Amino acid sequence: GSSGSSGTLRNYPLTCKVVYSYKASQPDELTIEEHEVLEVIEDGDMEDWVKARNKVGQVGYVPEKYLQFPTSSGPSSG
């Protein structure tokens, strides 16, 4: 999407931190590696998979389960 859309859901975009490395085996996926924070612009075609763009600019589908979203919980009251 060239200067077309940005995100109307999940308060996108959403910056995530790749905590678990994942070698892309498909041309539709995105090669990610630990210590690599990306920017989720879309929830991808699938639900479990999301669309993110790495520093290189490559955009592919990646597993959110491994993605470290900002929306955290934290410790208990006090």
UniProtKB/Swiss-Prot annotation:
Disulfide bridge partners, by residue number: none
Compartments where located: Cytoplasm; Cell junction; Membrane, Clathrin-coated pit; Cell membrane
Post-translational modification, as annotated: Phosphorylated. Phosphorylation on a Ser residue is important for recruitment to the cell membrane and for its role in promoting endocytosis.
Superkingdom field: Eukaryota
Its biological purpose: Adapter protein that plays a role in endocytosis via clathrin-coated pits. Contributes to the internalization of cell surface receptors, such as integrin ITGB1 and transferrin receptor. Promotes endocytosis of EGFR in cancer cells, and thereby contributes to the down-regulation of EGFR signaling. Recruited to clathrin-coated pits during a mid-to-late stage of assembly, where it is required for normal progress from U-shaped intermediate stage pits to terminal, omega-shaped pits. Binds to membranes enriched in phosphatidylinositol 3,4-bisphosphate or phosphatidylinositol 3,4,5-trisphosphate.
Subunit structure: Homodimer. Interacts (via SH3 domain 2) with ITSN1 (via SH3 domain 4). Recruited to clathrin-coated pits during a mid-to-late stage of assembly via interaction with ITSN1. Interacts (via SH3 domain 1) with WASL. Interacts with WAS. Interacts with CASK and MAGI1. CASK inhibits interaction with MAGI1.
Domains: entry comment: The F-BAR domain has an atypical, flat shape and binds preferentially to flat membranes. Upon heterologous expression, the isolated F-BAR domain is localized at the cell membrane, and causes the formation of cellular protrusions.
Protein name: F-BAR and double SH3 domains protein 2
